[PDB]
Amino acid sequence: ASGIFHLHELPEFNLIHSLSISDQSIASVAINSSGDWIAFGCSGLGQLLVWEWQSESYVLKQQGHFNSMVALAYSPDGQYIVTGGDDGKVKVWNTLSGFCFVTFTEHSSGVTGVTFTATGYVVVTSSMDGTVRAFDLHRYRNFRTFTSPRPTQFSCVAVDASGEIVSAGAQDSFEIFVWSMQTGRLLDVLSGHEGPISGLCFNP
């Protein structure tokens, strides 16, 4: 129940080694015919793990929270999909393989919107943290972060086709914030709406 598993050799009861998988309990366990691979499932976070004990390494390890996902985007090529969830994690999946291959945890609260740039392999997210962060896939780093002068929560993100302009809208301040990609300063605050902004989109 504590999330640890033990290995033993039964007739002598010799503890080979033990691991801790997660804070949640381990619901189901299975071993293959050869005996090299052991399968673990944790329903607390929906985490699946395949463990090779002789090599002391993971073959597969995935985690996805239930009802977490709220966002979607495609790469311009159509080869990758980036999503964000209420948990606050940004995940990139490869549609051909079907597995996630890079995950960004820089955001503290949930991600409301996500978008790819039209040309580069750059993914931009907006979160309830009050931050809009841009990540590159060449070096896997959060190279630019935009925040409002006023503490406000963003609900969506929109980026121009050229990629120079980044824009976001708020839950409460009722005004659209527009920043520059290369410089990173607040270009302007667009006002005139009354009530929260439901959505934004740039003309392609």
Binding site: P76, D77, G78, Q79
Partner: protein
């Protein structure tokens, strides 16, 4: 084989497809990424042989 087919049709009809390039965007995108995919891995591997082999062929000469 399909590389030769694509090369011939493209080199023959590129100018005519340019005028109606607006309505053919979902097709070209598709084609492009496919033709991209294979290419990249070959460009990673073949060159990694070629120059390296040449480098070996260099050392034997200086000896």
């Amino acid at each position: 084989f399909y590389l030769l087919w694509t090369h011939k049709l493209l080199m023959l009809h590129g100018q005519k497809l340019k005028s109606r390039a607006g309505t053919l965007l979902p097709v070209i995108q598709f084609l492009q990424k496919s033709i991209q995919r294979h290419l990249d891995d070959l460009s990673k591997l073949c060159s990694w042989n070629h120059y390296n082999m040449q480098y070996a062929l260099a050392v034997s000469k200086q000896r």
